[PDB]
Structure formats: structure tokens, C-alpha cells
Design a protein around this ligand. Sequence first.
Ligand SMILES: COC(=O)c1cn(-c2c(F)c(F)c(S(N)(=O)=O)c(F)c2F)nn1
Ligand SMILES: [Zn+2]
Length: 257
Amino acid sequence: HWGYGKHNGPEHWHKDFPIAKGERQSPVDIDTHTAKYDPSLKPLSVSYDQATSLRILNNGHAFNVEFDDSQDKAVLKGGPLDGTYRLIQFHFHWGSLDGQGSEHTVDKKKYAAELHLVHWNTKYGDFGKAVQQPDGLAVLGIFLKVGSAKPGLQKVVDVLDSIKTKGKSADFTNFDPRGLLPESLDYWTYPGSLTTPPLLECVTWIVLKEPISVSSEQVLKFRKLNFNGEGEPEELMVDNWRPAQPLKNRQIKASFK
Ligand SMILES: COC(=O)c1cn(-c2c(F)c(F)c(S(N)(=O)=O)c(F)c2F)nn1
Ligand SMILES: [Zn+2]
């Protein structure tokens, strides 16, 4: 089954998921000088005040903090989007070293990690239907650099000991994802895909210009997680990122000059 190792990693995925070589794959390099300012792009509207987190899960490729998406409680609107997208989960991708870990790159620069806040278009009724549509998901991507701690991340870091291995979950209620956002909501946007199998081409990517800083101790704790299940040989969950894919017939738009 797919993963991030030498024998089942990103270079292999196309054999089970041929869309890996498709026309709108993610992530991509964001060439800041070639991105086009679009003065008609609207500000993002991030409405997370009524967010209801439920659970945190190690799924063997990352950890997901899951939300109640059975009502419009935490929604993303505006920006390049038409309509309303509901927050279902967030997760991260990260490296074995501080100089790698992000999926998107900026002028070929890699960040230590990348946060994905995953939302689905409510006109499609459920997440499973949404991923089958070209405008089904909106993923808000936020870069992490190592420096000062992010206080709003700490509750996530503190629970990781309880979900060390694949298939473990823990209650994770009353977490406020607003504490993970940078000051600015300036962004780049382009049409792309899920960055893990099934690699479906259903995502409007919205990548924030401003990274958040996290501490070395915070990201070290991410790196103590395991890809494996309990009782299986230990394989540290690190380098769970897909590299940049060809841009092909796409232009990245910027909300800012
Ligand atoms: C049963 O189905 C699942 O578990 C499932 C998981 N995903 C999923 C994914 F593959 C992905 F790459 C990204 S990303 N990294 O934000 O683009 C996501 F946000 C995802 F939600 N899609 N389907
Ligand atoms: Zn992701």
C-alpha cells in the first residue's frame, strides 16, 4: 500500500493512482515573481468561532484533528471561492530536518512543515461526494518555520503521546483552530489536487503568504509519531510530504501585490 518510503513513496503512486500524472496535481512550487496579482480576488472569510473539534487520529500517514461538519460551524468563504466550504479536519506534513517538510515551496524554498485546513463545498452534501467534483474542496495551506513557539499549537503537541501509532485516536474537544493562523490572510490560489492518494483533482488551493513560527520542541514532538501500528517495527513519522509537481497549464494568482 502507498506511503512515503523508497518502495511505496511518491514516485510509485502513479501505478495505483494514474491521476498522479494529471493536469492539476498538487503541491506545486509558487514562483512569487510569476504569480499574477488579481485585484478582483476577494478577501478570505475564515469563520471559525463556532468550530467544534471532536477527535485526533493517527491514520498512518499524518494525524488529523477532526471537526463536526454536520452543520455550518466552521466555514471558509470568499477569496476565489463561490459558496460555503465546511471545515472537516486539519493535519500537517513535516520533515525529518527543519530544512524540509512542506509540500508547497516558495521560490523553491522548503518550510519545516505545512498545515492543511481541509474544507468541503456544502452544495455537494458530504465530503465523499465533494472529492469527486472539480470545485469540491478548499484547502487552506499555512507554512511553518522553526523559531518561536506557537502557543495555539501546544494542545495538539501535548496529545501526540496518546496517538503514537497508526489507528490510535483520542478525544480532542474544544480546540480552537483560530490559534493556528498568522496575522495576515494574504494568499496565493490555484486549482489542484489532494496531495495523497487518491490524488483527486478536486481542490481549490489557498496558500497563505505569511508562515507561522513553531518551536524546535514542537516540531520534534511531531517527529516522535509512528507510521506503524502498535506492536509493529517502529518507523518514525517524518518526511510525509509529496514534492512539487509540474504546474502545467495553470497560473497561480495572488491576492496581494
Ligand atoms: C477515505 O478517504 C480519506 O481518508 C481521504 C482522505 N483524503 C484527503 C487526502 F488524500 C489529501 F491528500 C488531503 S491534502 N493533503 O489536504 O490534500 C486531504 F485534505 C484529504 F482530506 N481524501 N480522502
Ligand atoms: Zn495535506
